[model samples]
Target: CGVPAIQPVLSGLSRIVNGEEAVPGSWPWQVSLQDKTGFHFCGGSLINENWVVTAAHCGVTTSDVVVAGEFDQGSSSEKIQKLKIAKVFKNSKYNSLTINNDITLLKLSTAASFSQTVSAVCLPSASDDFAAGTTCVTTGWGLTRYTPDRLQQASLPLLSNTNCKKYWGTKIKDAMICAGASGVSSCMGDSGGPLVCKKNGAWTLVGIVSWGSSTCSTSTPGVYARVTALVNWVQQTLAAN
Candidate 1:
């Protein structure tokens, strides 16, 4: 998401994750949310150098921090940028039991330095729209069939609200969208991660990893907080809080 990689390696590889490892710097705007012990248990997206968009249900505290420009958590690299979360803005209407309005914003204590491996993803505009059958991709360090250690990615075709509602019923509110595959979906640790799609030539953040079926099966698709639908709420929250 920065000056562009020298060879243009894995900066924008949007494909399925059949237990395949991700190329470093492929999704630079991705971040890792960790507790004070530096244990990453959730994912986030950098909207700016000093701000992150994630899920409210993650229960992140002031003690939690974000790790940016990270690909492999087990390996050490100079590209990794760690920053403390100075402020957390959770949606006021967030429903814990139902996981409705499951989005939040985290302000960074310091601005992150952008590089070939670090950058921010673009937020949706007021008029930004996502139609059914659109191609979207999600990346995170969550579990696969075997729960791999490195980062994983997959492409999920956007499903219509009606289609998604059929699967999730009233639980899938209007503020959420559904996407995922039979055996490929964002798992436990992927909560609060980004679901980006390319509409024209730009990659736009469309969804926030919120909830899904525990089994991660074909009949049930992973549900995400629709980012475009909540753009106004985000602006209001950022201004008020």
Candidate 2:
């Protein structure tokens, strides 16, 4: 009764083959941002070897966003890099009205090179479980359904947390984590990337794209940021520094 997991369909067909021809700085070393709104919201991960794991308001306003590789946003891509927040944890009941610990964990300025155009995403190793109707997958470039009409990087269907608690069980807590329900959600660079669901055989990273309320609407249940419930505060804050 176990042995039917193929890394969430090879991590959602490898993010639908790199977001089916993604443009706009095309992966430029896995983008990053804080408030300079040059672009790039979330799609971070690199478990160890330095630490990244984005979200937490993507720098809680402004602090880290280093490396502005080969871009042309707002003209000439406006190169920039300054990431160095050292540390700034969240989830201690983080609730800016109900983002539910939105999730955070930076500590960058070290590792960032896994090309396929910069890659990294593969969590869940021990307590891997995707209950309630199983079958999960959720990528991002965001907003193909809830509204708007342009901005790529997409993938969907990460439903089943018990029908995502019947529509986010009234505000999805436990640090919110619900991906599409076959309705296909995720927008604007798909915050913090990866939601994949399938274990044992492979494909894990149970969720990360946190923060949602506007784009990708409908029933409005596309919030993410529950990487296995913060796996013990991210392994005790990267083994307590």
Candidate 3:
């Protein structure tokens, strides 16, 4: 699931805080969750031909569309595929207040045809726990002041729960993960996006962008729904649905 037909070129890009534009089709698993108006709202990861993983807070619905193989929203390309959503599964345990279990799953009406510019990301195994200081990459069309037309990427370092808790206190739960760097972090419109790290030459989904401070402050690291902690739920939901 982690394999992509087109290898991502991470070199020569800026961070997400003021992230640099990614090469077209580099992050093939990246999806743009958009409304009927074609306005890009949240980011998601293609986990399979028919399922997408995003943040429950994105509030995606069957009426919305999932755009894969896309890079710039303002322009169209042969690689872009806009498909309808058949269903949405939000975690019943999701809590808006505490922001715990902030994941959601989307079922595509038609399976996405995998191509060089379209593919699925690998989900982490239940026991996969990336250590602190490990570098990961996050991609999105989120706001860096005003959202960029092209997708943006940031290189972030994983933070230990103990150190991350210092910034978040009791609010930080075991199901959540933290990652950020000096001046780089995910911001609005990037919700439900992926935080992936390379494991054994394959990119593994480690976290899903969940919550962070109002300001993408350098002092506070961005928090995500830890994929390892919720892999069971994802698998069960995929099977039942």
Candidate 4:
């Protein structure tokens, strides 16, 4: 299958790692989940023109809005859209304390038009198995060394469920994936964003940001809701009203 027509600016040969500012349009599907005041507290990924995927734990839905195609999240841009949410769908099995199945879907009140800075990402097949140590990318307007006006992009190495469980113990669930490097990981405000991996040269949605340690430590991997594990449910939900 062909990938989406999203543009990505590859930060070539700088050895730039985590918490680096993302080039505009590098991640067209990245979205900011904002509150009434337009403060972005969480992140999301556009699954389609009408749907976005995020973490249930982010606690954003309903009247809250989403800003998509935003590069400098704090500034106005012609390519950006300030859209209202039409519906919220938190996983029925989501747990607050344990954070299991920490996933949610938001339906947009108006359809989003694709542009150079706006696009939907491809979802991996339910049966796809991305092996351990696969390189993956995540983007958000999250906290870096400081608050970022521009979106941040990080490339992390995927950890196997076994190794991840070993590092975090029984807290890791079967429906989750983990990834982080010694100095690279997602932190506050990055919650609910997409964890994308390239397979066969196509970028595919692999996970949704769930939770991480309080320190945003690279020593411990941050967990995500495995998208492959819920592909059927996502499809069913999208097929429904």
Candidate 5:
């Protein structure tokens, strides 16, 4: 191992590597796929400019390519990206095994360009409301050990909310947004990435890092996807169609 602080801080700690560059990675993207009988590795993100926000069962229809951003594994062709999810807006209540609405959005025909590794991330101003110990960050590439090496991962700290009926009091609901730091948090590909919350100083983009059942030190934390309940459908799906 090359060891840079041992890298890949596992999952769920909020993330930041290239996003601070004003939407690099060519604009908020991540969509790793694997349906060639390799179980069903899933992930997606990339809001507009081509569009991508994943987890509609990962893909059996996007067409091909999928992958997005970093996670090591040889940088997956320099931070993954293969697009072909044209669309998959599920959230009438998704539950791919407790993924609920699970989150989904992808529509790429090529449209993302910000250089220096790519960048774009700033969505959450439907009168932004992020309060609950407040402290965010979360990014992804998936599988440093969720199924095994898809590469790219991230983690950080200060994100409290283990609730779920006061800790497994019975499933859990209301979209979902529990951060972590028990055993590490945000696992199995990181789902969609981004839980950024800063306020006054400016960071916005309240949660999208969805799901959590175990991993991140355990105690079942790390479940995001509540950008203020989709903020009127993410401002009517980024508006201006």
Candidate 6:
């Protein structure tokens, strides 16, 4: 599931603060969850032909649609596919106050046909654990001051839970992961996006954007729902639904 029909070429060209624009269709599994007015609100990762993984905090509903194979929002591309959301499955254990279990799943009204620009990301196993300092890339259409229409990408190193706690305190739960560096971090509109790491030649879904400092401050790292910790729930849910 983690394999991309069209490999992403992460150019060093520049959402990410200190980030750069991504090559079109590079992240084939990346999805843009949009509102009825066609406004891109949050990002998600296609985990299967019909299921998408997003953030519970995104507050998405069936009314919203999932847009895949897209690069720019203002400009149209033949590869883009917009599909209706049939249902939303938020984690029953989700805690808004703590933002724990921030992950959510979306069922598409119709299965998306896999293509060079449309595919699914590989989910990490329950026991999977990436070492601290491992580099990962996060992509989204989130704002960067002017908020470019093209997707933004940033390479961030995974931070240890112990070190992360120093910045976020006890609020950083076991289910949460931290990644980022000063001047490079995920900002508003980037939530629910995928944080992927290359493993065994395939990009694996490792994190789901969750929270960060209100000002997108340089001192704080971007927090994500730890995929390794929640993979079991995802598998079980997908199976049951």
Q: Where's the lowest-lDDT run of ten residues in candidate 2?
A: 1-10
Mark the regions of model 6 whose C-alpha exceeds 4 Å error after superposition: 11-17, 144-146
Measured on C-alpha atoms, candidate 4 has an lDDT of 0.79
Q: Against the true structure, what is each candidate's TM-score?
A: 0.88, 0.31, 0.93, 0.91, 0.31, 0.94
For candidate 5, write residues 1-241 as lDDT tens digits: 0111222233222243211112223223444554444333555554445665555444335455455454443332564445445555565566777665556565566665533333445566556666665655555544444334433334434343444456544455566666654454456335565555556654455666665555444445566766666656655654633
Candidate 2 regions with alpha-carbon error over 4 angstroms: 1-19, 26-53, 56-65, 69-82, 94-102, 105-152, 155-162, 166-177, 183-191, 194-223, 226-241
C-alpha RMSD (angstroms) for model 4: 2.3
Cα lDDT tens digits, model 4, 1-241, are 1154555554532113345766667788888888998777888988888998899999876878988888786666447888899999988888888888888899999998877778888888899998888877777766633555777777777899989988789989888998874467556338898888888877898988887767777576778999998878888899995
lDDT of 4 at 180: 77
Shift in Å, residue 68, candidate 1: 0.3
Error of 3 at 153 (Å): 0.6
lDDT of each: 0.76, 0.52, 0.84, 0.79, 0.50, 0.85
lDDT measured at residue 170 in model 4 versus the true structure, 0 to 100: 92
After superposition, which runs of candidate 3 have C-alpha atoms over 4 Å from their true positions? 12-17, 144-147
Alpha-carbon shift of residue 99 in model 3 (angstroms): 1.0
Error of 4 at 72 (Å): 0.7
CA lDDT, candidate 2, residue 239: 80
Error of 1 at 11 (Å): 13
lDDT of 5: 0.50
- In the range 1-241, model 6's lDDT, one tens digit per residue, is 7777767666443323657878788889999988999888889999989999999999999999999988887785456889999989998889999999999999999999889889999998999879898988888877633558887788878899899998889989989999875567666337899999999988999999998777777557889999998889999988998
Candidate 2 lDDT tens digits, 1-241: 1121111123343333223323443333334444465454455544543565666655444354634232333344344443544555665755766666667766665554443334444566436566644555544445532343222444555555556777656677765667653444355445765566546654566777765546445345567867777767877777887
lDDT rank order: 6, 3, 4, 1, 2, 5
